[model samples]
Target: VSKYANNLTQLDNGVRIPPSGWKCARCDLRENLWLNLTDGSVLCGKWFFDSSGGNGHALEHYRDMGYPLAVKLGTITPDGADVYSFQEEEPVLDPHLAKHLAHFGIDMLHMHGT
Candidate 1:
């Protein structure tokens, strides 16, 4: 489990993620997206070294806001989600994924990996 997981601050107002799909908040790209577990901002992942496309907006958001945790979009399920800690710079397990996602009204049981 992530050391940061126990101290995350979720938005009291909640977030609205389209059940239909997800896209970067800063770009038109739809793939390689990550959902900020703090304020619910959906942003694109880093542009990889191998030429895969991404805007790295998610990491930028982390730099600006200091929000540490984000979950990969299209990888959420009842069992678990692909959560990452920018502070740790690696993927980490979130035992409270279901509850954390519930803050944004996302139901893991009904979700499927894309």
Candidate 2:
């Protein structure tokens, strides 16, 4: 995997990650959205805000409003050719989100959020 101009080997710690997706959700070898990932903005969903912020209806990546809000922190290269991708230190699970996931029988998560 890589960022706008650097490959994963270029990433610190030299850890190798996939092109740009999770193990469970695979996409094209080049799945990226860097063009809209404005600099100095949070990585995840930054594009939505930039594109639709004035509309007062930013896109919610998660389809359901009751689900958890996955907040991530990472560097987004203008392209995914040379960059390191990282998620947040911890996933933030709103109380309602926890309950919603629980209701859907998805309570057992490998990660946790307070």
Q: What is the model-wide C-alpha lDDT for candidate 1? A: 0.74
**Model 1 residue pairs with clashes:** none
Off by over 4 Å in 1: 46-52, 111-114
Instruction: Kindly report which residue stretches of model 2 are placed more than 4 angstroms away from their true locations once superposed.
Output: 1-23, 27-68, 71-91, 108-114
Error of 1 at 94 (Å): 0.7
Compared with the true structure, all predictions reach lDDT values of 0.74, 0.24
TM-score per candidate: 0.79, 0.20
Best by TM-score: 1
Query: What tens-digit string does per-residue lDDT give for candidate 2 at 21-99?
Result: 3111221112222111111111233334353222211133123121222313232122212222232223222323333
Per residue, candidate 1 scores C-alpha lDDT tens digits across 83-105 of 87888888888878888777677
RMSDs, each prediction?
3.2, 17.1
User: What C-alpha lDDT, on a 0 to 100 scale, does residue 8 get in candidate 1?
Assistant: 75
